[PDB]
Amino acid sequence: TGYDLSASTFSPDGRVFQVEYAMKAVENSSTAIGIRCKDGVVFGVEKLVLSKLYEEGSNKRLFNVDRHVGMAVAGLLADARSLADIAREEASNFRSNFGYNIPLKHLADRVAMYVHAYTLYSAVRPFGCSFMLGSYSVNDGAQLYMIDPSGVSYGYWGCAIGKARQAAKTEIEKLQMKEMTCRDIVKEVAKIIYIVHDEVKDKAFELELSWVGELTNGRHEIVPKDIREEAEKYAKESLK
Amino acid sequence: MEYLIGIQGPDYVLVASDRVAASNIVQMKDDHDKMFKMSEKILLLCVGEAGDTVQFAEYIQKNVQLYKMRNGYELSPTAAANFTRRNLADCLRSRTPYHVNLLLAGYDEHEGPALYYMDYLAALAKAPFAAHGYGAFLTLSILDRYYTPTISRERAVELLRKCLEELQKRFILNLPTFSVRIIDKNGIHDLDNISFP
Amino acid sequence: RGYSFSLTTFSPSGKLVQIEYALAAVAGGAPSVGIKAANGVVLATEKKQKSILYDERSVHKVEPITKHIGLVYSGMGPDYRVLVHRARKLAQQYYLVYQEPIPTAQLVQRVASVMQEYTQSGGVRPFGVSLLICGWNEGRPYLFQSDPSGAYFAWKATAMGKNYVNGKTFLEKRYNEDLELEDAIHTAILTLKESFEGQMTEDNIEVGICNEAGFRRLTPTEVKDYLAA
Amino acid sequence: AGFDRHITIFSPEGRLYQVEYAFKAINQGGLTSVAVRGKDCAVIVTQKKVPDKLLDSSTVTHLFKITENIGCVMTGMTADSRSQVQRARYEAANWKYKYGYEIPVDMLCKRIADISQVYTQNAEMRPLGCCMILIGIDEEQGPQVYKCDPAGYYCGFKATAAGVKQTESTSFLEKKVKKKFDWTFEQTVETAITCLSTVLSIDFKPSEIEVGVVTVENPKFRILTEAEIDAHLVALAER
Amino acid sequence: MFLTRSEYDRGVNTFSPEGRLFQVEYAIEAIKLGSTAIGIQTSEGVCLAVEKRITSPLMEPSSIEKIVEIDAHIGCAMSGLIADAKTLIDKARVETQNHWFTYNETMTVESVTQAVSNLALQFGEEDADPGAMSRPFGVALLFGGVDEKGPQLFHMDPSGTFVQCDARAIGSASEGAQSSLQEVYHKSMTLKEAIKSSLIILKQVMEEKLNATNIELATVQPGQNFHMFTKEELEEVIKDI
Amino acid sequence: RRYDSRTTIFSPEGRLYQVEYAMEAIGHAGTCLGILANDGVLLAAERRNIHKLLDEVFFSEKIYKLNEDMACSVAGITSDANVLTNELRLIAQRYLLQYQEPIPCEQLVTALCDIKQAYTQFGGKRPFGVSLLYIGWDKHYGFQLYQSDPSGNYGGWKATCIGNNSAAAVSMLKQDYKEGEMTLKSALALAIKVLNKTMDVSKLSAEKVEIATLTRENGKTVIRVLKQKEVEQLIKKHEEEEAKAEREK
Amino acid sequence: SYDRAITVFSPDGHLFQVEYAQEAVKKGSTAVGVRGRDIVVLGVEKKSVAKLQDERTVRKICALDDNVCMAFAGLTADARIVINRARVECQSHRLTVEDPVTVEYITRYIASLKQRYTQSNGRRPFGISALIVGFDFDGTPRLYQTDPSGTYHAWKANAIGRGAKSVREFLEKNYTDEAIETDDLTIKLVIKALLEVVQSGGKNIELAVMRRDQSLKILNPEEIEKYVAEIEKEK
Amino acid sequence: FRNQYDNDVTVWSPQGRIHQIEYAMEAVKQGSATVGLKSKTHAVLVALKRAQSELAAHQKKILHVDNHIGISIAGLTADARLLCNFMRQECLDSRFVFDRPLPVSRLVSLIGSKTQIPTQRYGRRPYGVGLLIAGYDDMGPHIFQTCPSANYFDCRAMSIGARSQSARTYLERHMSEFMECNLNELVKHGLRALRETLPAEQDLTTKNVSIGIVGKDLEFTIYDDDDVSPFLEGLEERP
């Protein structure tokens, strides 16, 4: 069956299988989750330490695509870094032309359309990355968006990507994020990541966290290490 | 500043030009040849702004010889005239106008002798006799006076000598020597240079 | 074999088979009939709709390129509209250049040149549609056909679409050069009546006529009046 | 075979099977949309299915506003739908810029459909696997309903459906127009909801459906609130 | 037990399993079709020699040009496709003259070899220019010249890789000729000894008996410029052997 | 296996099979004929389209006028034929604009043949599946007949036929044609003879053929299409002559 | 496998499409060239008249310029294109450097063109090999050969096309300084060589000469008849 | 079979793996080994060079991009030369524009983008070369590796090329002491690490070793065959 070879093609039953094959790419990735609460959005990533040789604070999967928005990625890291460059360019162009910080919904739509361009044409493959975007602005509020390799974009109160998406999603489902505040949400994100991590298959992980919210005055930033250590100790204690 | 003269006849066309190429005041060359043979039986005489003359003449020469090599027969004089006129006229609108004034002389087996005239603006005109340059103003009346459509070639060289010695008498610039050649059915024939010491 | 798929590949025995396949696409299209009368030319085609829900006024299979030219098609609907827009544009370009209405022969030449332009490139497919282009110029009627191949022919009368062979036989039996268009429209609806496989009504068919006045699509009431016979 | 797998090549029967597969891609989504016209109103209804609780229900929508007085409902691939929606908005604004008046619904549908044609004729790109249904009010013609499909067919309609239950829904609607008495706004909305609910067997609640309307009184396209949808739904159940 | 599927060798820009990129390797195999060429670097100079492989007597011997002059300071010897060799020689010459124009100096042999190598690299098609051959250059060059560092001999291959080599052989009998080079060569040998040894090896590998006609020989010494041994000089040395 | 695709691959034994397959196409075409005479040159063709409901609106279906001084008849794909004739007319008028003289016949043929060669050589486009005859008068070589093929190769012929039964036409012309002795009337009679032999129809209909003649009258070329009455008279004369030859035996 | 694209090398590094074009050259009519001391003679066989064809249209030998001419064996249309391109290059070189083209310059240009068509896919090699003859400024005779691959080589004498192997073996045997001594002897040598492979002598050979400072002369059929008669009689 | 899905970079596999990129990642394994390690004050690159023959000189495995950055290559020398040219021009552009040395992290980001573009598009192959980038900047000493896949890492130490796992395990077990080492101790550690990769018969020599050092006071310098003898002499022997 030559239908799956290219994305220009359609299956006889109406399915573009290259895109689904690209969606299978992110499942290879280690998990990443983002939770939205009243104050803001918290992101977390389970960054597996492949070797002791690799420096800490390397292979970062949490990027800052503008001062007021952050990006968390799962799937091919090369494609993800390129998509982050695209998103940064889109945000800068929006600021330059329209004179203010890009709305997250619009940014998600533009990067999603850029992604969707690739599924159509035969010359170029779909992206191999699924990524989450999150921002807080006093006008818009807390917003969390996820973009699949297809270019589908939606807003999620809580979201997970990667290998352990389903388990992470049920754990997130039993949380009541809407009432909660960010400084608790970091602890619960750590708990969920420690739960879904598989010690047997994955040797070790270093929890990589970020948030954006009013506590930052609407700037996405990496967690202060004291708060990281507190959340990690809480997660280890709860794990039992 | 450069003189061209052409006299058509029953079975010939006579052409002559001054042999001076000059800087501001110094007459760098005394034996400059302003006649380019596009083919066996057609000559192109060119005067004008420096550089443009040789560039345009060489371009038309090589195009005509390419026509010869490709098709096995020479262009007609009228066709060569229209072709060089087209090339000059196209460049007039462009940023690189060739400021050149030309006289094309030819013999065709079917259509007989022909003399053609074109200015830098690329107008074309067949004529019995014609001249280019400031000396043309002095010498055209000589031709208009003594020319006959049935002029013999000895009479034509005599008439040309009269026209040129008038330049010697009156024209401010010094055009001491002139080159002369005839086109006929046989082909281009060089003639002795009319030299006024 | 490989000749089947490529459009820039002559098959053995010298056939551009993708074009033949496009003509097969034309043959599947709905019946269309064209009859050139002495004082006019009638273009007719069936506009059979899948359901009552369809609004007939929304789209038309018979379109005017100019005041005095109109055409009808059998084949692919989208391709028809691409070339009808291009035909209108070509006619307007002619009017800008020459300040005269374009002759029908010239228009069919230009649109056939477009259709040929598409066949050469591999990246594109041929237009899966054929046209009957009718016009009145110089106090004379005209009817033409232009195929996906980029070729054009001049027909006194012809049919395209389903059962086009049988319709053409019915026409050559029924055709008389002396016919006036009042009779020719009747003959055209009969030619279509051969091949409907349904009870034709004013909605189910679309028909248009050209004459000294120019091209027009006669209304549903008009075609009802003609259908009454 | 090999006559499929490229849009350009024709079958030996001249069918272009790839676009026909794009038509199947619409049904692969598992959602249905219905549009029905009225004497003074046009409505669009479609299923709204939220796979996960975590998804923000506000963000997920198949109803989009091409311009102030035109609304659309897209059925098929979500990404291709959003792209076609963006192209439609650009076409509408560009029409307003060039020609000085709001684009007609028919011309918008025609522009989008001929774009779909350039897709189905050029090799490298694929037809967008989505279907559009546009509703608006034209002053001359009153309400309008139109549909684009991946092929480039753009015909107007009295009423239509798209998605998996299209044949059942158009069978239902065909009966209702055949017993034509009229459709006021309430009856129009009721007909749409009854068609969708009957063909799906859903017996909807207000969250499960999203409805958008245009009316000659208020020409602007508006997406009704859950309260308005429940008001219409309760009226259906009561009678 | 034979597995001959290859199925990845066709088409450059395809990494086969184990990542070997076989089109370039086949191009490197291609130079073995060419006539054997041989280079020896010495303190007194660098010498280049090649077997002409004359097909017929009527062909003019001078026309075969498998050793050429990039400039006075550098010469080249080539084995492989004559046409793409001519292309690379043209690139070398224009780059040398561009260097003279811009910096009023003479290029080093390493720099010239790098210049041609950059052109050879362009088979990858990273550049968008249409006028670059998609196939790798099916030729190997030996660049011999006296520079600021003295006599130098550089080898270039279809990949575009280049290295200095005290002595190298390219072409059909490069295998075996290189073993003979390895045994005979010592760094101290004078250019006379190098010429004699290279001609011995060429006589061994060549199918036809060696004659002044069927070989081309050249040397560039620090005092001299690139020089080709004439018929008489070739006669003298091939007699001396 | 397959070295017949893409028109840019030399097959082993060095043959371009796409152009040969294109040359196969012209054989299907309606026969076209050209004969050279001392006083003129003619083109005669069989109107393969003999559908009852076709109108003869045009100057000619097969015969085209390219210039004041020449014409052509085409056998092959009609769309490529239309393209080639448009290109020919543009080439002729470009030469007239440049040199203010009529295009030489051989030069025009050579230019179009250069186009046809170019389409062979480059990858994407197909070769032109057309072969067409050129007839013209030029001051240099007088009346001339030229043939071209899809390959882009042309030649000068005293008389030749292209299309269906071209071999039979050439065999008949070889015996019949008298070098240096033809006149336009005799050449017309020969054309009717060879057309009757080649064409499957027992009687040449006089609506199933189109004949055009090129002659120089009063120093100006005239390209004329023989009208239906003229060709009717010609076929009547040929039938009478052939029957009388039959009657004697 | 490896014979469908020009770009792809084969295992063992053979580019096979160019070899196939070189094979295509072999199909063509024979051509022969020989360098006399003061003449260069270029001879080409003629396939057949066909009795309804005009011989003037078909001419294998052609003059690129006043001092250079070529003959070809291979695809006729490709030969026509290459001849025209070389002619325009000749006139352009005269335009650029105010000097007549050298034979090695023009054969280099033609070879570079053929090479340019080989290197890139999407273009097929010119299926021709050519024999270029001219006299240089010094007056030395020059004969060069080119092939679809794009290599060029000087030859004292050579043949191309069908029967090239046989006729070149004959020419390797026959050619010597003695034969080149006389212009008539050079013409007779090439005529005998073409007679080695041709159906009939006078009818089926078209021959031409270039002298030291004269234009190309295609020998008349009567002159060719006289020369073959002299050759025939001596046997 | 699954010979399909391997032909081009633009084809995803049924399990979400682009096989051509992995086949390119195999290319680094082909090349001779390289090792890089850093201290608080210095960054080091050391390499094992290979020679075609005894007469031939050893290949150049360490290349200087700028005073503050230099690279060592494992994999295709062609791609190495091209990427080195790109990096050199980027650094020159930074110095011309801003009059500051380019940050090494930003340079490897640029390399990653340039390398990523081939993988996604049809046409140019993935750059089948793996580079170790080492430099000193204001933040401190840095070592990065870049794969034929455009992903890049920041490393305390790393080894790429054939038989590099032995060097990696030596480096990992000895890593703690590296940070406080002198440059002599550090280069000696790296030399032993690459000595692990060599065959047992082979041993380190002046010829086949190249060392590249950069630091706060030291611009990038490649210590060649003669100059490596001070660093090599300290090493004791094979274990």
Author numbering:
A (entry chain F): 5 to 244
B (entry chain J): 1 to 197
C (entry chain A): 3 to 231
D (entry chain G): 7 to 245
E (entry chain D): 1 to 241
F (entry chain B): 3 to 251
G (entry chain C): 2 to 236
H (entry chain E): 2 to 240
Reproduce the article's own wording on this structure.
The proteasome plays an essential role in protein degradation and is critical to maintaining cellular protein homeostasis. The mammalian proteasome core particle, 20S, is a large, barrel-shaped protein complex composed of four stacked heptameric rings, including two inner β-rings flanked by two outer α-rings that are each formed by seven different α or β subunits. There are three types of known endogenous proteasomal activators that bind the 20S to open the α-ring gates.
One-step affinity purification using an NbALFA nanobody resin yielded proteasome assemblies capped with PA28, including double-capped proteasomes. Cryo-EM analysis of this sample allowed us to determine structures of single-capped PA28–20S and double-capped PA28–20S–PA28 to ∼2.8 and ∼3.3 Å resolution, respectively. However, the ALFA peptide density is only observed in the 20S antechamber that is proximal to the bound PA28, suggesting that the density could be uncleaved ALFA peptide that has just entered into the 20S proteasome through the PA28 activator rather than cleaved peptides on their way out of the proteasome.
